[PDB]
Amino acid sequence: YEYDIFWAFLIISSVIPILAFLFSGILAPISKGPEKLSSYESGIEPMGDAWLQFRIRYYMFALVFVVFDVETVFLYPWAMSFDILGVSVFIEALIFVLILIVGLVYAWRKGALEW
């Protein structure tokens, strides 16, 4: 079957990091110390714990990416059935690509894709 190899390969690929972690645990020594476990901050003592809180206008491309992922997912089955059918699916997906282009133009002009 064409998919039992997929499951076996997935199991092996998940097992490999477990084997690496086990081998490191049984081979590498442990010498923990309070200075060693401190977070690295280029020598100096770290201040408050991490955290940046970006601006919204920077990370507004993600809302475009969510929609565009769905559009590119929807475009695949049409391409798979483009040869069995004819110009009907061409006309069908032309509106999809045109709406994608119009949305990209709107995001470009409104400044959503500006950093």
Binding site: S42, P46, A50, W51, L52, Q53, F54, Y58
Partner: protein, 371 residues
């Protein structure tokens, strides 16, 4: 957005872009630099205090430890302070040798600026490319002075020793090869689209701001100001050679890069002209050269200020004597220490990745910023 939204990161002494042990406390608002605070002094060895309680012949090894890339400039300022105080003349051959060594050190300093600058931009190969020829410069220095760095070659009223046999042709061949190498560097780097788009419009400095902030050298000359202390103060024999002061009108980092490339080319021209017209005669001053107890140079009782055009700007020495071997006061005016204070103004409202470009545009090495 005042607090708990602003990330204060200590891009401190251990950072690849931080040249040496410079620390920046950078406050970021989503990769946007709100401001930065420079903390220096991680290499403060108290060299001004060690300048006292040391004779000049003892303090000369200490001199090369500020601006360790351009060591001959610091050696020149240290040996020309007291020799101006004592009215000691320098022979013409020694002056020509000094000019040649200073220009070679300027070439090496501009190279080892270009390396870390392009590394901070993102290109690592130019570092090895500059080191291929800085090793040749080191070979010339070791053939002449005896060591690659920390030469201890400059002396009061002259130099340590004459140039060895077969040095002029070696230096001329180095100049011929290095011109080709510089053309290769400009072919690889100067018009690159990524390099330009990382450099073209960062750190715009006005000429008035450059004057007020105390900037000197390629920093001040990259704001529309043609101010070189070699042609203003008539240092050594720079009035005899044909050379041009490299200055640019725009204030960005690209102007500084172009200025340093042109300064390397003009320096090469200066070595060629100096070696073509080298004079004869003595090099050490025979008047000062005189088991018996040997005193050092007793400085006169007056104040003095001496300047030099270091590759990083203007390097100065304020010397107050005390009619004794040990100077009463020895203040060092470092070009990098004064060029660094404009960095928070430049990086304000810029981005995090632009800090590397701005700091690489300024020729800062931490051994000269503190003393």
């Amino acid at each position: 957005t005042t607090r708990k939204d602003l990330m204060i990161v200590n891009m401190g002494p251990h950072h690849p872009s931080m040249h040496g042990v410079l620390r920046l406390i950078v406050t970021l608002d989503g990769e946007d630099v709100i401001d930065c605070e420079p903390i220096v002094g991680y290499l403060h060895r108290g060299m001004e205090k060690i300048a006292e309680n040391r004779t000049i012949i003892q303090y000369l090894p200490y001199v090369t430890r500020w601006d360790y890339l351009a060591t001959m400039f610091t050696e020149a300022i240290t040996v020309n302070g007291p020799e101006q105080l004592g009215n000691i003349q320098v022979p013409k051959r020694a002056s020509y040798i000094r000019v040649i060594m200073l220009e070679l050190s300027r070439i090496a300093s501009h190279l080892l600026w270009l390396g870390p600058f392009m590394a901070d931009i993102g290109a690592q190969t130019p570092f090895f490319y500059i080191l291929r020829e800085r090793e040749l410069i080191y070979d010339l220095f070791e053939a002449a002075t005896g060591m690659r760095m920390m030469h201890n070659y400059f002396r009061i009223g002259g130099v340590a020793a004459d140039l060895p046999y077969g040095w002029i042709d070696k230096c001329l061949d180095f100049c011929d090869y290095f011109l080709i190498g510089l053309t290769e560097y400009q072919k690889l780097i100067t018009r690159n689209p990524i390099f330009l788009e990382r450099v073209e419009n960062v750190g715009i400095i006005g000429g008035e701001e450059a004057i007020n902030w105390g900037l000197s050298g390629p920093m001040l000359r990259a704001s529309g100001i043609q101010w070189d202390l070699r042609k203003v103060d008539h240092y050594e024999c720079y009035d005899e050679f044909d050379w041009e002061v490299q200055w640019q009108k725009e204030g960005d980092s690209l102007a500084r890069y172009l200025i340093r490339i042109g300064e390397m080319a003009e320096s090469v021209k200066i070595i060629q002209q100096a070696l073509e017209g080298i004079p004869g005669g003595p090099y050490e001053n025979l008047e000062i050269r005189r088991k018996k107890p040997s005193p050092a140079f007793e400085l006169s009782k007056q104040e003095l200020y001496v300047r030099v055009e270091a590759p990083k700007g203007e390097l100065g020495i304020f010397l107050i004597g005390d009619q004794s071997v040990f100077p009463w006061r020895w203040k060092i005016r470092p070009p990098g220490f004064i060029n660094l204070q404009i960095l928070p103004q430049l990086v304000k409202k810029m981005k995090l990745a632009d800090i590397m470009t701005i700091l690489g545009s300024i020729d800062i090495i931490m051994g000269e910023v503190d003393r």
